[PDB]
Design a protein around this nucleic acid. Structure first.
Ligand code: ZN
Lengths: 217, 122, 157, 212, 39, 55, 51, 7, 56, 35, 116, 62, 50, 97
RNA sequence: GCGUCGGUCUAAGUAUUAUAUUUAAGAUUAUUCUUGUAUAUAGAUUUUUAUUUUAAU
């Protein structure tokens, strides 16, 4: 605290250790609400220096459901109106209905999450990634563990449904070397009978494709 | 600690009141469902009108037969009520314990077989 | 409601016996008394008729999927979470669209995947194109060199 | 009863205890790790399996930081082993009003999308647009028109990695946001702040000397 | 018949009134059954 | 106090449903005999429906 | 134990992956010594590893 | 069937 | 130190009127921490009885 | 500033059906819209 | 008056409503919103276009040679994202006042106040 | 209600007592959904036998 | 181009939702006046395949 | 706010030039005419810098690419030595000072 | 406690109904007038009395 109009930033306290009472509690790390304590016992400046927060979880962390990212039900000590009674109360976070679209499982999915999760989802690139880079005891949800499983399947199904495109392109490539000439349409049966990729399915499928050449023009 | 249920605040809280609900505990009353009991039906209510099969049927380890002499903490409240109260069957005759010296379920001879109607025991 | 015998026989010989040439047992003829149930009774005994799809593969294409480098992991279906309990208490919960809700998902086995925006799909199609590029070395032989350059960096030291 | 009590989490090093739990992924609250594999093997054993050049690599003191939880202070040197409360603070402090205003996030459009009401473009293909937080989540992402503009999203698509600092800091007050709009207007849409764009008005004659 | 004494909180905020809110002393050696759970 | 054969009861539950309430067991869903297997696309065609009709 | 198992197209059973057992995280149990699960599915059991 | 559809 | 607080007298006496329900007991005095035993004291688990109604 | 003629109201239907002080008048988010 | 959710109990004010400070102000607001949609917005984001595309053709060519890079690459160094503009999301409207009013002692005191 | 529906008339006769075999088969404690009569029978033709409920046996014991 | 006028998708299908937000249904919104066709029309059945 | 001195080591994202930018002593808003919003958000904000710019966009001008942006990754000074000690003596002239 | 009556309720129960009350059934009748609660109300208070509540010196 200094009184000049324009106090340009500087390395150290320009005018000695900052004077005032509230500067006395900031010089020791406490927050400026220590100025309103009537007793500042060695436990008090421990209690209010936030060494370890007096703040807990509504249900057991092992049995928690709604995704509370990094929150507790912190109690806020209020001082009442005209006659200053001091009372305290437990303030919760705001849980929104998280109705997201996790494109891993190509469908909306709902998990109720605190506002802070609805931000850290978007900071993580998607809803699913926020489920996936968090880990067990960190993402202490239960719904988050039911939707991580579907996320872990419906990912390892994409990877599986990918290698299809590498076992299919292998066939498609290696069979083209036997669809080389249109000499015999009795032979196009035999090459198809070779890879057991029947004609009646393929013929019209290519037909629908040349029609699709006409469906897309 | 009433709210140990699946946290769903804006939706309907399934089961909420039903038999199978959450948020009612584990070792609770209201668990008539769980009427499934390993002990055979006939030994907790007699095979016939006279409450024949009624009793506490200790069983041999090897014997596949299942008896209702449990000692789990959830089952001793009824295993004493057999030894001190006894059963007053709705037919008028007092069952397993009817007089002075209360039985010793753990010194019973082992359950040898379920009762039959035609003979006594299969 | 096809209840009175005169009405059930007037429908059952015509639609389930006549049109479909199905024949219903006695105990099912009891509940087979509505337009809703007539439709289902058929739609079970005709669904139990389609020859079970025969997974028959040729040989010439078979040796392709064997020698092909990239193979499928193919065990994930079990990782899926189980919801086993009394069929009612499990089903009473889905009294409404409690289906996609609260970390559940009606997993219908999917055979093809949308490729647009699908992170986990582009997350590997590049990792694949990073495998075809690394694979190019072993084809030409710059891998063996760049690998034989380590041991000659790690020998004289 | 516990048959096969599990081994400590990160016991993989030959002559120093495993790092404390929580840091490896476990239960916080204890500072000093300990593994009965290490403490039972006599000293010479622990000095047999290791050469001096190695212990100086696992003696290694990463003093304030934690070698495992990258970016956070080692939880055997804090006041108490729990995670750093200060870094992971809930977005609302114990007394403030929730006046976190509407925030617009950047999304990478994936198809040339063309509004039919304003008759102009929500976004070209593969260009990041700042869209609403509840257009993106509810209309742009579920259909495959867009994804988020994260670092790795750029990596997956083929675009030069750009750091939008997506929600790097959320503003808890409108005028605390309307400053963040001024920071983001500079880094992202920088052509607004060129000596050529501050002078479109004047690339030619001051208008009072031109014809009519 | 029973009583939690806490009074059932809203189904949304499951816990109001921890016993600490009243400056209660519940040492295991003082009243016995004390030690709370949010701890 | 229950009435089985009550023409409500959803016809699957007449012993599971004497419990559950007076205000819920009408809604107790239909599930299965718990041994009825899904309709199975097996190949057993009715004894005399035959092909031509089956085809 | 059947997750991530190359089905071989002869016996249609899981091929013996020698790597699998290394990406496997033995989750303990009471009626089983130590059930092995692949690494990716390890966090769903985060409570039993704490019990 | 996928190799079918490419052609 | 933990300074003696003067619970019985002074303000801490009247503070009960000044909106303070729970006047704490001095849990710094008995602070020798060894458990008491409840006045409905339990009798040991040995079956004292030796009548004909002795129960297993 | 020439744009300070903000109409001390707004179209938004007042939440809080019942009645009370502070209804149906401008909000500092709406006052920045018209501005 | 559904516009402002007003049931009228007293006559002779249902008449004087149409020009009441509640109605006439709710008239202006629900109108200027139309103004924005009717003419403004389809022209505002018109000019926002016609200056950018001006830039990326009249200025960015020469600017890309300053980075020593290709022209297409700079359109991601001079516009890392296209922060379009709405009524709901204007950053400020005016650059805050540069010459701030000069502080004084408490109650016009002079030459210095001992109090705050 | 089963004669009226199937015969188009009021029964107009003394109804048989002793409910027919096969009626009230899901009921368990009939005793009210009946007179104090026994649970009628199975749907059989075997000779009538009292289902020895705990009650019937007591009457024997009187 | 891919036209889109907004006011579209609302992710959840238009039945399970209010304007936005999936709506709650809890066997107390429902009447007992449905389910009263059971007095004549019997409930659905699972006919086992022969 | 700020009361205690601390120097960070900010790493740019455009050139990765690890430049250091300190935080001097800026005095508390006056307690004589107290203001509860300006104080309790001065303090809570001070923990967020003291914990290495946790919830803030960092806006300092680079020294290598002379321009002011918001792309800095705040390096804890043992992630900095991880970087500083691991650069050939020439690139220390390029990325460091 | 029945009836009458007042108020509430057409997305949990049938508005000749069920909630929520005041009275007391049966038989005659059930008067005059309003300053406040309630309702309605229009940024709220302040204003404001179809029925109801309480009132009538
Ligand atoms: Zn730089």
């Amino acid at each position: 605290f200094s009184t000049f109009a324009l106090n340009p930033e500087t390395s150290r306290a320009p005018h000695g250790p900052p004077r005032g009472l509230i500067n006395r509690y900031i010089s020791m790390g406490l927050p400026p609400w220590a100025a309103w304590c009537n007793r500042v016992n060695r436990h008090a400046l421990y209690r209010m220096s936030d060494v370890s927060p007096r703040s807990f979880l509504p249900k057991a962390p092992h049995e928690m459901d709604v995704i509370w990212m990094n929150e507790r039900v912190r109690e806020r000590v209020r001082t009442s109106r005209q006659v200053q009674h001091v009372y305290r109360q437990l303030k919760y976070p705001f849980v929104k209905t998280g109705i997201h679209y996790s494109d891993t499982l190509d469908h909306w999915v709902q998990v109720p999450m605190v506002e802070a999760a609805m931000f850290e989802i978007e900071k993580d690139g998607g809803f699913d990634n926020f489920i996936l880079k968090r880990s067990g005891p960190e993402l202490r949800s239960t719904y988050g563990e039911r939707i991580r499983r579907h996320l872990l399947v419906r990912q390892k199904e994409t990877q599986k449904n990918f290698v299809l495109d590498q076992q299919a392109k292998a066939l498609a490539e290696v069979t083209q070397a036997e669809l080389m000439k249109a000499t015999s349409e009795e032979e196009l049966d035999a090459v198809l009978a070779k890879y057991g990729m029947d004609a009646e399915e393929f013929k019209r499928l290519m037909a629908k494709r040349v029609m699709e050449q006409r469906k897309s023009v | 600690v009433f709210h140990n249920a699946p946290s769903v605040y804006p939706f309907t809280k399934p089961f909420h009141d039903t038999p199978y609900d959450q948020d009612r505990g584990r070792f609770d009353k209201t668990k008539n469902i769980l009427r499934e009991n390993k002990w055979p039906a006939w030994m907790d209510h007699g095979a016939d009108g006279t409450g024949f099969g009624i009793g506490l049927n200790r069983t041999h380890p090897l014997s596949k037969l299942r008896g209702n002499l449990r000692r789990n903490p959830s089952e001793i409240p009824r295993v004493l009520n057999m030894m001190i109260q006894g059963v007053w069957h709705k037919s008028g005759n007092k069952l397993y314990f009817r007089g002075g010296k209360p039985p010793n379920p753990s010194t019973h001879p082992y359950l040898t077989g379920e009762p039959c109607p035609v003979y006594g025991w299969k | 409601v096809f209840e009175e015998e005169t009405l059930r026989e007037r429908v059952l010989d015509r639609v389930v016996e006549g049109v479909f040439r199905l024949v219903p047992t006695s105990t099912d003829r009891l509940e087979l008394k509505s337009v809703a149930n007539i439709i289902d009774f058929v739609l079970t005994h005709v669904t139990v008729a389609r020859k079970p799809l025969q997974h028959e593969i040729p040989e010439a294409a078979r040796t392709v999927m064997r020698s092909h480098p990239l193979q499928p992991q193919l065990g994930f279906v079990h990782a899926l979470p189980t919801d086993n309990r009394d069929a009612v208490v499990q089903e009473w919960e889905r009294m409404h669209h409690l289906d996609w809700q609260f970390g559940k998902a009606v997993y219908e086995p999917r055979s093809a995947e949308n490729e647009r925006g699908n992170l986990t799909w582009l997350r590997e199609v590049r990792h694949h194109e990073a495998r075809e590029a690394f694979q190019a070395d072993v084809d030409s032989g710059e891998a063996r060199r760049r690998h034989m350059a380590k041991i000659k960096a790690a020998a004289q030291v | 009863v516990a048959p096969w009590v599990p081994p400590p989490r990160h016991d993989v090093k030959v002559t120093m205890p495993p790092p404390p739990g929580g840091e490896v992924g476990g239960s916080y609250g204890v500072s000093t790790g300990y593994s009965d594999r290490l403490a039972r093997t006599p000293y010479w054993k622990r000095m047999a399996l290791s050469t001096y050049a190695l212990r100086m690599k696992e003696n290694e003191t990463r003093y304030p930081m934690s070698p495992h939880r990258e970016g956070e202070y080692d939880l055997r040197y804090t006041v108490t082993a729990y995670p750093d409360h200060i870094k992971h603070r809930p977005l609302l402090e114990i007394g403030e009003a929730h006046q976190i205003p509407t925030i617009e996030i950047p999304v990478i459009f994936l198809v040339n999308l063309w509004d039919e009401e304003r008759l102009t473009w929500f976004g070209r293909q593969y260009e990041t647009v700042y869209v609403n937080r509840n257009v993106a989540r509810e209309e742009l992402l579920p259909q495959r028109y867009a994804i988020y503009a994260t670092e790795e999203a750029y990596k997956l698509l083929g675009l030069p990695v750009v750091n939008h600092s997506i929600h790097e800091e959320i503003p808890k007050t409108p005028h605390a946001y309307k400053k963040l709009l001024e920071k983001q207007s500079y880094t992202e849409e920088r052509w607004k702040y060129t000596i050529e764009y501050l002078f479109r008005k004047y690339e030619a004659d001051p208008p009072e000397l031109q014809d009519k | 018949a029973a009583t939690p004494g806490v009074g059932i909180a809203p189904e949304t905020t499951p816990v109001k009134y921890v016993p600490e809110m009243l400056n209660i002393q519940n040492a295991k050696w003082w009243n016995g059954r004390g030690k709370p759970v949010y701890r | 106090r229950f009435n089985p054969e009550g023409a409500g009861l959803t016809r699957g539950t007449s012993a599971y449903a004497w419990k559950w309430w007076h205000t819920q067991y009408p809604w107790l869903p239909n599930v299965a005999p718990a041994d009825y297997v899904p309709p199975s696309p097996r190949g057993i065609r009715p004894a005399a429906w035959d092909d031509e009709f089956a085809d | 134990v059947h997750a991530n198992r190359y089905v071989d197209h002869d016996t249609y059973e899981e091929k013996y992956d020698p790597h699998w057992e290394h990406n496997a995280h033995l989750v303990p149990d009471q009626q089983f010594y130590n059930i092995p699960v692949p690494k990716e599915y390890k966090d769903a059991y985060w409570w039993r590893d704490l019990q | 069937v996928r190799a079918t559809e490419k052609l | 130190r933990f300074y003696r607080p003067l619970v019985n007298q002074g303000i801490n006496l009247w503070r009960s009127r000044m909106g303070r329900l729970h006047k704490g007991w001095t849990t710094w005095e008995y602070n020798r921490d060894v458990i008491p035993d409840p006045r409905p004291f339990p009798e040991p688990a040995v079956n004292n009885y030796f009548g004909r109604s002795r129960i297993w | 500033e020439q744009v300070q003629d903000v109409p001390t109201s707004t179209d938004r239907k007042p939440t809080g059906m019942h009645r009370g002080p502070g209804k149906r008048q401008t909000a500092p988010k709406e006052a920045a819209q018209y501005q | 008056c559904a516009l402002c959710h007003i049931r009228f109990r007293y006559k002779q004010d249902y008449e004087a409503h149409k020009e009441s400070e509640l109605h006439v102000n709710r008239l202006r607001w629900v109108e200027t919103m139309n103004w924005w949609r009717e003419t403004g917005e389809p022209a505002y984001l018109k000019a926002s276009n016609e200056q950018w595309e001006w830039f990326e053709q009249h200025v960015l060519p020469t600017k890309a040679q300053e980075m020593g890079c290709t022209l297409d690459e700079a359109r991601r160094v001079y516009r890392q994202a296209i922060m379009t503009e709405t009524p709901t999301w204007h950053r400020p409207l005016q650059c805050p006042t540069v010459k701030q009013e000069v502080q004084e002692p408490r109650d016009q005191r002079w030459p210095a106040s001992p109090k705050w | 209600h089963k004669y009226l529906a199937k015969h188009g008339m009021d029964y107009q006769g003394r109804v048989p007592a002793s409910p027919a075999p096969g009626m009230y088969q899901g009921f368990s404690d009939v005793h009210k959904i009946l007179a104090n009569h026994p649970k009628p029978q199975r749907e059989s033709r075997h000779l009538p036998v009292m289902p020895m409920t705990p009650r019937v046996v007591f009457e024997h014991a009187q | 181009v891919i036209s889109y006028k907004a006011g579209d998708y609302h992710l959840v299908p238009k039945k399970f939702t209010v304007g936005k937000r999936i709506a709650v249904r809890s066997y107390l919104d429902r009447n007992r006046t449905e389910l009263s066709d059971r007095t004549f029309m019997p409930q659905k059945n699972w006919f086992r395949p022969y | 706010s700020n009361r205690f001195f601390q120097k960070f080591y900010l790493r740019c994202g455009n050139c990765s030039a690890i430049q250091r930018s300190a935080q001097g002593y800026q005095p508390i808003a006056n307690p004589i005419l107290f203001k509860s919003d300006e104080h309790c958000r001065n303090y809570h904000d001070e923990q967020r810098r003291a914990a290495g710019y946790s919830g803030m966009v960092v806006t300092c001008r680079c020294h290598r690419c002379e321009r002011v942006h918001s792309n800095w990754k705040v390096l804890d000074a043992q992630q900095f030595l991880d970087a500083k000690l691991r650069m050939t003596p020439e690139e220390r002239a390029q990325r460091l000072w």
